[PDB]
Design an enzyme around this catalytic site. Sequence first.
Site, PDB file in Angstrom:
ATOM      1  N   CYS A 252      -8.252 -18.303   2.905  1.00 17.69           N
ATOM      2  CA  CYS A 252      -9.098 -17.612   3.917  1.00 17.69           C
ATOM      3  C   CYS A 252     -10.287 -16.807   3.340  1.00 17.69           C
ATOM      4  O   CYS A 252     -11.216 -16.931   3.607  1.00 17.69           O
ATOM      5  CB  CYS A 252      -8.056 -16.808   4.786  1.00 17.69           C
ATOM      6  SG  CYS A 252      -7.008 -15.520   3.869  1.00 17.69           S
TER       7      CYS A 252
ATOM      8  N   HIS B 102      -5.003 -11.185   6.693  1.00 17.50           N
ATOM      9  CA  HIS B 102      -5.610 -12.622   6.872  1.00 17.50           C
ATOM     10  C   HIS B 102      -6.933 -12.184   7.435  1.00 17.50           C
ATOM     11  O   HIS B 102      -7.153 -11.439   8.183  1.00 17.50           O
ATOM     12  CB  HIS B 102      -4.731 -13.185   7.877  1.00 17.50           C
ATOM     13  CG  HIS B 102      -4.930 -14.759   7.585  1.00 17.50           C
ATOM     14  ND1 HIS B 102      -4.627 -15.485   6.464  1.00 17.50           N
ATOM     15  CD2 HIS B 102      -5.426 -15.570   8.690  1.00 17.50           C
ATOM     16  CE1 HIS B 102      -5.194 -16.818   6.918  1.00 17.50           C
ATOM     17  NE2 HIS B 102      -5.375 -16.682   7.961  1.00 17.50           N
TER      18      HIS B 102
ATOM     19  N   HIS C 223     -10.826 -20.330  10.484  1.00 18.67           N
ATOM     20  CA  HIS C 223     -10.123 -19.561   9.377  1.00 18.67           C
ATOM     21  C   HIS C 223      -9.272 -20.514   8.581  1.00 18.67           C
ATOM     22  O   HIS C 223      -8.777 -21.812   8.959  1.00 18.67           O
ATOM     23  CB  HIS C 223      -9.173 -18.450   9.726  1.00 18.67           C
ATOM     24  CG  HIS C 223      -7.960 -19.041  10.567  1.00 18.67           C
ATOM     25  ND1 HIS C 223      -6.723 -18.373  10.227  1.00 18.67           N
ATOM     26  CD2 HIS C 223      -7.568 -19.895  11.578  1.00 18.67           C
ATOM     27  CE1 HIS C 223      -5.803 -19.033  11.044  1.00 18.67           C
ATOM     28  NE2 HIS C 223      -6.479 -19.884  11.772  1.00 18.67           N
TER      29      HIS C 223
END
EC number: 3.4.-.-
Lengths: 651, 264, 142
Positions: C48, C99, C111
């Site tokens: 990510c 994240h 993502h």
Amino acid sequence: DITRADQIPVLKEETQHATVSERVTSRFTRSHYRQFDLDQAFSAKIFDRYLNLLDYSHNVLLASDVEQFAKKKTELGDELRSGKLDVFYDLYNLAQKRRFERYQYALSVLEKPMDFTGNDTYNLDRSKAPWPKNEAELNALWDSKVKFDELSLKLTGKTDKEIRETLTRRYKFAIRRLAQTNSEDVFSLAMTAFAREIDPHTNYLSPRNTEQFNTEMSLSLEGIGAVLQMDDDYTVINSMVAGGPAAKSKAISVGDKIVGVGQTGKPMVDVIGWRLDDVVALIKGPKGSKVRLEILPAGKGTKTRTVTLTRERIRLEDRAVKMSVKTVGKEKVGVLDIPGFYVGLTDDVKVQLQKLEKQNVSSVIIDLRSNGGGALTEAVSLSGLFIPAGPIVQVRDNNGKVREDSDTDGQVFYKGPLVVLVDRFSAAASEIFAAAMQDYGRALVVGEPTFGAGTVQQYRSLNRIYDQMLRPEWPALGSVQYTIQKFYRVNGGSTQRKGVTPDIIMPTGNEETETGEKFEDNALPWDSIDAATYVKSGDLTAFEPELLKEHNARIAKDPEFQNIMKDIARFNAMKDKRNIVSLNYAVREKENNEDDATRLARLNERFKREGKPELKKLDDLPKDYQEPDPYLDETVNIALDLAKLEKARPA
Amino acid sequence: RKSEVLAVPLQPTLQQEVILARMEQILASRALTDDERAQLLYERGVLYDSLGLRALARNDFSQALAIRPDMPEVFNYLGIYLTQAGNFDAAYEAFDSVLELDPTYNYAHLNRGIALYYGGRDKLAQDDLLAFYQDDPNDPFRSLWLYLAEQKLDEKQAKEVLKQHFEKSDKEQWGWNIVEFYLGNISEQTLMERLKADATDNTSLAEHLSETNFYLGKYYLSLGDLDSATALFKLAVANNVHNFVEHRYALLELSLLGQDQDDL
Amino acid sequence: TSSLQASQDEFENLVRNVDVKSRIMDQYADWKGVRYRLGGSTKKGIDCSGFVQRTFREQFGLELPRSTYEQQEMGKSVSRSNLRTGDLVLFRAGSTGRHVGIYIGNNQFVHASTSSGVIISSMNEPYWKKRYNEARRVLSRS
């Protein structure tokens, strides 16, 4: 050099001034919350205001000339909107020449006693008075002020031989500096007369004053920082900038000073008796400039040497960015001292009031004493720390649209109970802050009823994009500050006239003070728009009996609150005959000894109470810091009992 | 509740589109001075305005100003757009800039008057519009705007001043017929028939209908007939003459009526 | 009250940022379906944070740091109610602790998830709706 009336130069309006006025007039006439028009009546009021501004104390005024120029008291509107400020300049020049006519005989005579004090009186409020008709009365009365000043200097002051010659020098240099005023003074005086006639907060700022406001709203001084004060053609470099980069080169000090200097390679213009504004403007420079620094014997000496020093972005700050949130005492109870709602006050206070959200919070205090309002967006960004995303202030223009300003970025970071302490000389943004917390019920209002400002102003530059291109020889143009909107609380009420009535009244506030928004000219009326949407945390604003009687016990249980109440009783007794003061040196010496004995008695009482040695003579004790504030101590006690409740009131 | 004249709503001409295409081509090239670039930007903004693309027109005007800051006409158009947007203070300032760079641009007065008229400063609007009337008293629309301003001060006085202006004119330009209707001298039917008579092609008919429908909408609005006012303003804007002040301010009046309807 | 209502500055801002979503979607089209790999910066496998870095560098020229934690302190914080495309959306995943994704509008964010690699996902999905943290704006240009 110095001669007679012919020496007084005939002042002329400057080239750009006209245009400046025009633009100003335009704004003031077209965009302002007050729906007014520049009619003959307003022109006459401007005439009267400009007269009162020329000499507030009604000293040197002349009915003949006043009525001679009251003929064109209707044309001032055309004068303003046309830029030809002829009447203002002519009247100011006549006032300058008449300054010589004011008086002549008294000067240098500072010791020999020529007049006795046989139960005479003198007015302290000299605003309401008719225009003087004759000449002899004022010529005789003028000496009275300086003679009473020197008699009080015999009552209390320095030694005679040292200060008297300097006082005579000061009077001659005052006459000199009166004849050294520039056209910008007359222009700004006229513009200020106009603006204050419109609205007490509307104002015009000269380019110098525009830079002043910019620095007062940026702290980014451009030059060398140093707080200065002058006495007879020599300024004393206090230079309290300590940690300043131009102060790192402290090769010169308070006594190592020179007058004539250059800037970044300019010819060293020997400034001899110039104005403070002029020499400070010469001392300033842009970001990335230089300055001529002369090396001289650290004390009194005539031996100059030439070297250089650098200029850059310098930010003099009387702020404390200290972040020491420790659990000391009984709770994390702190006092936050705010000097002004700076544009960077949120950007420097976020270091202080942010990092305690997950950890344990406490009853801290925020003190808004002697506050000056700087920005509204900053006021809302600072007031969003204690309120989780809510409207802080409502604004209303002359049309009727209402907007609630709130920064939609961030939840209540400081989840602790809070006490706000405010005085009567507080800023308007501080009123917004305290009103937000009072209507939200999250904080506690403590202190004195505020000033009572409820108007929002716009601060705008007077520069067009084409000014630089086709008028390069023009200097920097002024700025304007005119009331555009009116602000209100989320409860619907406003603080334009009624102010804020706090839950915890202070003793010094119980007196009927002759200061505030009411005693300001052309103050706006009061109106309460409908209440906003807001979540109130308990109706403890109208019902504060828990801490009210506790702090009444505390103020009746200490002699400091009682001595302060005696002071306010002395105020309430003297204010009957405050306007006309009687000057009899016998009773004046009596009251001076009475005040000195009362101060010595109170100091000995507090020394006995605190266990510190008693003072007997005034010579050993130098000038130092007196007691800061017992009302901050009562706020700390209030925060303590608030933490007591929060420990005993989770249910 | 009345029969109305109708015109074919104006469509963009071929000339306009060829000119706009070539302007895009020329601005695409690098071989152009800054003065010529600002000139072409102002002309292309003018063409966008004539086509009703007012945001693109304002963009080209702003760019031409960012090139040459001494363009009074660009300030004029920007002030007109500020009036249309309802930001009246900025419009005042823009027209002030117009008169500062050039005090002989008389139409600026009119525009600023209209701004002040829609702002609420009826006296200052009266001053500006009366100045514009002084520049040419025989133009009927100048007297019409002066009357629209003065009506917010004194209805009887304004109507009498309008009648005096009409009597003092040469009564040669067609617009005075509108004034005549405003004075209770000709029936609305006579007004529309004189309109039909004075129009030669579809474009002149569209112009006539735009101006007359705007002023008639203002008239019926002053009398309290909201529906007739809205209908007349719509019929005005339907003529697609985006360059007329009547068109712009008819859209503005429709916006203000919608605003008044929305808030209860 | 239609087009002229928006000021000239707002008009320029709209013209300058009208293609942000289009650029992010260009990056997505060139990069959709790439596998997930911890500490990967290539089409063979990416994470990510690396995807965010490459996207903001290749589509806008903003050189953000490498770790999700450093990116989380980059730019300026933004609230959920007023978040625009090109802002960084942070979830409390916990596999590495945090994240990072790129919001594209309509409760959607691009993502590189550990489960299905680089993809579009919805903010209203139960997993992500339950596990939302903060949001940061880094495309400072208006």
